[PDB]
From TrEMBL, chain B:
It is a peripheral membrane protein. Binds 2 divalent metal cations per subunit. It catalyses: An aryl dialkyl phosphate + H2O = dialkyl phosphate + an aryl alcohol. The keyword Cytoplasm does not apply. It holds the Pfam family PTE. This is Parathion hydrolase.
Length: 314, 315
């Protein structure tokens, strides 16, 4: 069985150590091509991303899932150039984040389903690069449009086997409403990662979703470094409850950011100079010294993402 | 001010001819036509419909359109250049921002927005080398804080380059008055500004006071009433002529050949109500005004001389 990357299909075995929630650039639709000098230049942003991915490579990372959607300014040609030059697999995403323009906002659930299908089954833009995941974002209480997006995501996942990954505010238990809507469409929890779950510290929330078969995205560990040790101990708490197979870990890093105040990227890079290598270089050794076996950590960073990303019509 | 930027390169002022100063090839959102061309049937189908529509307009005398679609209306300048070449009609492209800026625009300072508008006029749009010839700005209400930044950045790009500013209001709220106050605070001459969508309200005192201050008055959406009648909208042109303000009038259709930034199928409703498309101004409004007694020299002044003076980069 095979996973779509920006360089074409790969086998499950080739994915290796996978970071399941990352971004090359957090931007807006059209913005990198209209104003590349916001980032210095397109070449500067690509170079910064290739160096950072090569360093993550130096640490063991073999695949990242770029969960930038259309409205996060995903530029799959950028992703392809960076993947090739870093020699790291990148999974592209479809879906919608929190900044849809009018042309998306106004669409029905049936139209949105066709757009997500197009990106999975045909390709993104005119590139022929197919998405391997669907990303959906909600506010704490899901809005009417966000509910349409979740329903279209579920329908596109049921038709193609590709998984869904979510943005929450876990501070607001946002995954419970997302999961209820997704299940109303018949989507299996084993096809869904409830993301940004490391921003909440009520373990009851994490364990209940994991007991239903959801993947738990503990995906923003180094954002607390801008305590990260405490967020990483959520990984250990889920392992200790018996939910190893439900854990996904990532940095939620980026190499350029225009969807926030200017110069935020410099602040972030000062708090986490390891960038995407933070998970393999800091978190993994930390969990090792708390007594988690290497085998458990390999299961979380290799086997769990492979099972999550492999298209499964179940 | 001897040449104007078009999607085919510079043209001299005399080549612009009959100009429609507020039009769109497609009303959409940034990145959308590239990501989902099948919303419009296909990219080829949208292009072919726009070529037939422009050629229609050209046979009715139009020589240039100003496509006032900004980044956030999904302007695709490569689509504009293709259509301009195939229809042999000049198209002036725009910079600026309309009412749907994404977060990456909404979070920018006035200095940052000024640099963006300047790059699209002085360097080029995207990697195409096609340079804007107008700055479009939309406001609502009394002008929001972000919209005020856009207006100020627009005035600053105008004053550095000479290209004019054209606005989207609400004439029913006299919203041009607030735009004019902000733009004048920046030192921009009213003769470099069109207050647009002024035909949406039959408030003659509003129009004449802005015209007397030197603003151009954009009576730019006449057939939207055919989708207040269109004739009533067209009599606002006659009223300004009769007050001696012919030099301040700009007319247009505000037409589109595809629309994704509204409900599905609105383009079909619109086309059924105005089958003339962008030829509505020359086929319907111009003969209506002739029949009301407006002479040829005045109509050529409105449709040729005023757009030339407005678009020529000045000061
Ligand atoms: C683009 As984000 C901060 O929602 O991972
Ligand atoms: C795109 As419009 C209706 O403001 O001209
Ligand atoms: Zn997120
Ligand atoms: Zn993210
Ligand atoms: Zn408008
Ligand atoms: Zn318009």
């Amino acid at each position: 069985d095979r996973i779509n990357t920006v360089r074409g299909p790969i086998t499950i075995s080739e994915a290796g150590f996978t970071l399941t929630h990352e971004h090359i650039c957090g931007s807006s639709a059209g913005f990198l091509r209209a104003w590349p000098e916001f980032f210095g230049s397109r070449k500067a942003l690509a170079e910064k991303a290739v160096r950072g991915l090569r360093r993550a490579s130096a640490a063991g990372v073999r695949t990242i899932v770029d969960v930038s959607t259309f409205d996060l300014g995903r530029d799959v040609s950028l992703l392809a150039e960076v993947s090739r030059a870093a020699d790291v697999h990148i999974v592209a995403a479809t879906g919608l984040w929190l900044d849809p323009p009018l042309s998306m906002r106004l669409r029905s659930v049936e139209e949105l389903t066709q757009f997500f299908l197009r990106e999975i089954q045909y390709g993104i833009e005119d590139t022929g690069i197919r998405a391997g995941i669907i990303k959906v974002a909600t506010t704490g209480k899901v809005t009417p449009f966000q509910e349409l997006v979740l329903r279209a995501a579920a329908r596109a996942s049921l038709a193609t086997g590709v998984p869904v990954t979510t943005h929450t505010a876990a501070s607001q238990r946002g995954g419970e409403q997302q999961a209820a809507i997704l299940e109303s469409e018949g989507l299996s929890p084993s096809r869904v990662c409830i993301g940004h779950s490391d921003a909440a510290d009520d373990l009851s929330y994490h364990t209940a979703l994991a007991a239903r078969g959801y993947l738990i995205g503990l995906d923003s560990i180094p954002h607390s470094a801008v305590s990260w040790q405490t967020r990483a101990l959520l990984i250990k708490a889920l392992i200790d409850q018996g939910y190893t197979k439900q854990i996904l870990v990532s940095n939620d890093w980026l190499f350029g950011i225009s969807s926030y105040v200017t110069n935020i990227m410099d602040v972030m890079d000062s708090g986490n100079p390891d960038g995407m290598a933070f998970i393999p270089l800091r978190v993994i050794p930390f969990l090792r010294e708390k007594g988690i076996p290497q085998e458990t950590l390999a299961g979380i960073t290799v086997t769990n993402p492979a099972r999550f990303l492999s298209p499964t019509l179940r």
